[PDB]
Amino acid sequence: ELSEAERKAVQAMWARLYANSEDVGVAILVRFFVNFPSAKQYFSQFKHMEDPLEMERSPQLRKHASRVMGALNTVVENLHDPDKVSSVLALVGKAHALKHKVEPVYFKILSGVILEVVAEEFASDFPPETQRAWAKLRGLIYSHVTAAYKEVGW
Residues of the shown chain interacting with ligand HEM in the complex, contacts defined by CB under 6 A: 39, 42-43, 60, 64, 67-68, 71-72, 92, 95-96, 99-100, 102, 106-107, 110
CB of 153 to ligand [Xe], least distance (A): 26
In the complex, minimum distance from the CB of residue 64 to ligand HEM, in angstroms, rounded to a whole number: 6
Q: Is 103 helix (H, G, I), strand (E, B) or coil?
A: coil
> 3-class SS at 127?
coil
**Is residue 9 close enough to count as binding ligand [Xe] by CB under 6 A?**
no
Q: How far apart are CA 27 and CA 21, in angstroms?
A: 10
Contact region for ligand [Xe] (CB under 6 A) — 1-9, 87-95, 108-116, 146-154? 108-116
Report the alpha-carbon angle 108-20-76, nearest 5: 50
* Residue 28 near which of ligand HEM, ligand [Xe], none (CB within 5-8 Å, type-dependent): ligand [Xe]
Q: Is 96 annotated to bind ligand?
A: yes
Q: Which of 3, 60 has the CB closer to ligand HEM?
A: 60
Which of 111, 92, 109, 139 lies closest to 39, judged by CA? 109
Measured CA to CA, the distance from residue 52 to residue 34 in angstroms comes to: 7
Tell me how far apart the alpha carbons of residues 148 and 142 are, in angstroms, rounded to a whole number: 10
From residue 54, how far is each of 31, 48, 141 by CA, in Å? 13, 11, 30
Site for ligand [Xe] contains 132 (CB under 6 A): no
Residue stretches of the annotated binding site: 64, 96
Write out the residues near ligand [Xe] by the rule CB under 6 A: 17, 24-25, 28-29, 65, 68-69, 72, 76, 111, 114-115, 118, 137-138, 141
